[PDB]
Amino acid sequence: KPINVAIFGSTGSIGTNALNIIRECNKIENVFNVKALYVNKSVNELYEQAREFLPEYLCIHDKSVYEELKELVKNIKDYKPIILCGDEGMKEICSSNSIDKIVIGIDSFQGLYSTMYAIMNNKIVALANKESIVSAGFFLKKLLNIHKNAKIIPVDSEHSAIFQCLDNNKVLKTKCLQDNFSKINNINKIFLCSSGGPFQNLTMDELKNVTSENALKWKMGKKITIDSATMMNKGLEVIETHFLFDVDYNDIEVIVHKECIIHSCVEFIDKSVISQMYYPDMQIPILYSLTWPDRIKTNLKPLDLAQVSTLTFHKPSLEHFPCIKLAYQAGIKGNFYPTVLNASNEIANNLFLNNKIKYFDISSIISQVLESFNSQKVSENSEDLMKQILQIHSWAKDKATDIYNKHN
Amino acid sequence: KPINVAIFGSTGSIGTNALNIIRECNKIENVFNVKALYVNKSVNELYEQAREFLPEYLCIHDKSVYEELKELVKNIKDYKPIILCGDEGMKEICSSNSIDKIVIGIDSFQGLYSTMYAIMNNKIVALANKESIVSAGFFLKKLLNIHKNAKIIPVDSEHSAIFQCLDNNKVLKTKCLQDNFSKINNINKIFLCSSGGPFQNLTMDELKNVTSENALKWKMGKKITIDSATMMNKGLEVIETHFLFDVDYNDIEVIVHKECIIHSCVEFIDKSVISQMYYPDMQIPILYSLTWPDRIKTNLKPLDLAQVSTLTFHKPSLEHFPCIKLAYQAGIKGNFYPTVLNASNEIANNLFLNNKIKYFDISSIISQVLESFNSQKVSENSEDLMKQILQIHSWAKDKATDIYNKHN
Ligand SMILES: NC(=O)C1=CN([C@@H]2O[C@H](COP(=O)(O)OP(=O)(O)OC[C@H]3O[C@@H](n4cnc5c(N)ncnc54)[C@H](OP(=O)(O)O)[C@@H]3O)[C@@H](O)[C@H]2O)C=CC1
Ligand SMILES: NC(=O)C1=CN([C@@H]2O[C@H](COP(=O)(O)OP(=O)(O)OC[C@H]3O[C@@H](n4cnc5c(N)ncnc54)[C@H](OP(=O)(O)O)[C@@H]3O)[C@@H](O)[C@H]2O)C=CC1
Ligand SMILES: O=C(CC[C@@H](c1ccccc1)P(=O)(O)O)N(O)CCCCCc1ccccc1
Numbered sequence A, B: 001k002p003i004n005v006a007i008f009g010s011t012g013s014i015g016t017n018a019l020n021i022i023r024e025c026n027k028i029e030n031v032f033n034v035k036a037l038y039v040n041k042s043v044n045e046l047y048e049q050a051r052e053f054l055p056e057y058l059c060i061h062d063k064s065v066y067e068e069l070k071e072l073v074k075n076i077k078d079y080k081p082i083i084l085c086g087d088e089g090m091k092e093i094c095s096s097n098s099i100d101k102i103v104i105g106i107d108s109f110q111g112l113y114s115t116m117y118a119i120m121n122n123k124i125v126a127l128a129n130k131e132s133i134v135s136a137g138f139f140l141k142k143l144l145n146i147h148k149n150a151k152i153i154p155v156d157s158e159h160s161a162i163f164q165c166l167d168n169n170k171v172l173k174t175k176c177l178q179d180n181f182s183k184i185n186n187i188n189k190i191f192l193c194s195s196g197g198p199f200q201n202l203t204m205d206e207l208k209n210v211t212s213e214n215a216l217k218w219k220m221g222k223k224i225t226i227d228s229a230t231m232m233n234k235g236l237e238v239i240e241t242h243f244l245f246d247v248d249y250n251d252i253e254v255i256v257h258k259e260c261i262i263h264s265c266v267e268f269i270d271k272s273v274i275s276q277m278y279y280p281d282m283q284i285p286i287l288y289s290l291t292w293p294d295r296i297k298t299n300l301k302p303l304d305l306a307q308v309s310t311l312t313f314h315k316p317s318l319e320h321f322p323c324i325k326l327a328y329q330a331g332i333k334g335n336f337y338p339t340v341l342n343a344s345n346e347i348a349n350n351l352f353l354n355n356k357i358k359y360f361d362i363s364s365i366i367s368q369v370l371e372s373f374n375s376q377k378v379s380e381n382s383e384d385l386m387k388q389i390l391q392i393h394s395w396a397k398d399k400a401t402d403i404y405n406k407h408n
């Protein structure tokens, strides 16, 4: 009866939101069993979570804090968890027959590995990590074609919104990242809403001067926070939309909705538009990924539309946010251009965060790597396709670093 | 799979909107056969219609233009219609094996009659007439419990909106106007959107002296326009929401949304809200009633959210719009109070339309009628129940008139 769940990246923003909504849902009845928690190196924060949730499995990626973890956990009386580490641990958890659903709240391209293995074990993958889908979308489509009972359920807020707007009567006849998804669901077009980030109203001259301090000083991972500022986040989410829902790029329209109430909208083939709305929130997206196709009761504050009072919508300027344009170009070009987009952005984002480059150098570096990349024949087998993705990802990161290094 | 449809009230606002969208959709591909058309007396209109759609059946209420119609239709070559008259014509059309769906665009408490026989013939009934639901809700529920394969599909725009927000895998486990509809669909609360009508920004002192001219001078027919001005339309729509969707009155919130793009919203038990949005329009509500649970391609203009730019929401003042309070009060008391509200408002509306009373006299008459009613033991017998509704309706109209004449 309980839904058996793993939380990967349990100590981050998504992971902590997941555990928060699970805690509330488990007050009276045993709705969810937290069977596994996995982190990189936050061994103290993992210990505190273990003390509360007492999962069968704990896993740390960083083997150097494995002893610390083991030492900490022996303070918890009558608790005998399976304590694992690294990729071997991740795969052991994905293989467990005692796990139904896995929340992927690991950041960056790194989230791909556990997403892949979750799929290969026919799990429900509640995927917040968008870099996986951007970098490896065609590959995930192939994996999901092989592993017939695996499913990706979107957690990224706009993609959860879109998914919620659909008729589950049709959703149930397909699954995300499957050819024909949009046909089966009668999808015509997507309005992909955006906060527009901190720099949305700056002039060109002002935007030239922005720094990461400006962008940093809502609340979440720092990487996604810089991506929100450049609107590369929205760029990635465009490609995420394409893959998840089989919607053509010309039918994805970015809309800046600064009140962040309408989370995104779906236009059907009759031109009726359905939208999902709430306060800016990740608890509903996370919970829904784990209850779909059902909903369960929460005690979240109800939307007070009268108090919100006013909702606004405008088109983003591609001159001010050229990262959006680069993401459409990469997506439309297909092949491995999204891999290269994602990888070069990982580097450009980090350079800007650490005050090494300017705002417009972000899009400049990305554009330059994209222009440099030569299309490659797509490997027909899964294993070769994955190695190909890894090689191109690494290449693109090194290329971006080399561009940075050469022009300074 | 032809969709075989009858239009009742074919020459009215709902009716021509229905034939409009059928005609346009059929240009894209032939999905609809208009199998029957019915009107009151508008016989040149029906002729022109019948010439275009060439339906199997034609029917006109009034005997006194029955022969005339037949004269008109001899013109049309290669076309041998079944041409009928009055209630026998209606009953005959409802009983035809050829006909699958019936749009009810007949207005006023009168509209109940065709609805009943549509249900008794186990049809899909696309019901725009809200007064039928308000006056006869409990009876329609009983009738739909007997006729298991009959279904009401909402056409009133807000109720169509709500219905379109739902997951049809849950809808298909129930149907509208059934106990537990909201439970099965995990509905927590409704935001019922309103234009607010013409008087939305007037002071109490200004409302004292408004005339029907002020209300009449979105162009619609006079009765619903006056109800929109008093917001009794929305009061009626609150009760309609209650019966259609089994939502408690304290979970229905009227919100004034003057741009009329969001047509209404559904809050689920997780506090997620879904809404339907389009330009103010009856084509999609009618269309969806005939395609449900599917959608088809239209050539309607796509919503341009950027251009709309701003959406606003505020709570209506119950002091300025006391008809809303009266509707909640009648609904909450249950029994036949909704019958009484609807009937008394038919009279009060008409009095104000004809400059016989003032704005606040509308709510005052309705209030006094409601006060004079005593709840009645509800007949368990279907036939007796319909007699009770007719009697109470007629009693309430008489009472409202007496109150008017006594003070006047
Ligand atoms: N935050 C949000 O609201 C939203 C996030 N997302 C997406 O969700 C993902 C996570 O973002 P967010 O939670 O902000 O990120 P955080 O930086 O807050 O957290 C990342 C988590 O992943 C863990 N982790 C990192 N590397 C590994 C690894 N190799 N093995 C195991 N665990 C690892 C971290 O562990 P440790 O603590 O040990 O470092 C941490 O628990 C991103 O892809 C982001 O785009 C999408 C929508 C919104
Ligand atoms: N108009 C709108 O946009 C909306 C309408 N509705 C509801 O829809 C219903 C219809 O509204 P609307 O179309 O504005 O009304 P109209 O007055 O515009 O239309 C009346 C139509 O019904 C026909 N009719 C009336 N009585 C009979 C009868 N006894 N037998 C056969 N046909 C009859 C008329 O025929 P004839 O032409 O011969 O007179 C005419 O075609 C109302 O209950 C209203 O509340 C609700 C929301 C939106
Ligand atoms: O991609 C994103 C973040 C980036 C987008 C964003 C930012 C801010 C508001 C709305 C949207 P962007 O449009 O600027 O790219 N989301 O999907 C998360 C939106 C829920 C944020 C609020 C929250 C509450 C609690 C915990 C954690 C987070």
Ligand SMILES: O=C(CC[C@@H](c1ccccc1)P(=O)(O)O)N(O)CCCCCc1ccccc1
Pocket (backbone or CB within 6 Å): B156, B157, B158, B193, B194, B195, B196, B197, B218, B219, B220, B224, B227, B228, B229, B231, B233, B234, B260, B280, B281, B282
């Ligand atoms: O109940 C109603 C009419 C009353 C409500 C209303 C009025 C005006 C706009 C939106 C809503 P109210 O909130 O004022 O009570 N609808 O359901 C019709 C709404 C689709 C109108 C589109 C249209 C087609 C033709 C001519 C003109 C307009």
Ligand SMILES: [Ca+2]
Pocket (backbone or CB within 6 Å): A064, A065, A066, A067, A068
């Ligand atoms: Ca150590």
Ligand SMILES: [Ca+2]
Pocket (backbone or CB within 6 Å): A163, A164, A165, A166, A167, A168, B165, B166, B167
């Ligand atoms: Ca849905």
Ligand SMILES: [Ca+2]
Pocket (backbone or CB within 6 Å): A188, A248, A251
């Ligand atoms: Ca298209």
Ligand SMILES: [Mn+2]
Pocket (backbone or CB within 6 Å): A156, A157, A158, A237
């Ligand atoms: Mn997002």
Ligand SMILES: [Mn+2]
Pocket (backbone or CB within 6 Å): B156, B157, B158, B237
């Ligand atoms: Mn309406």
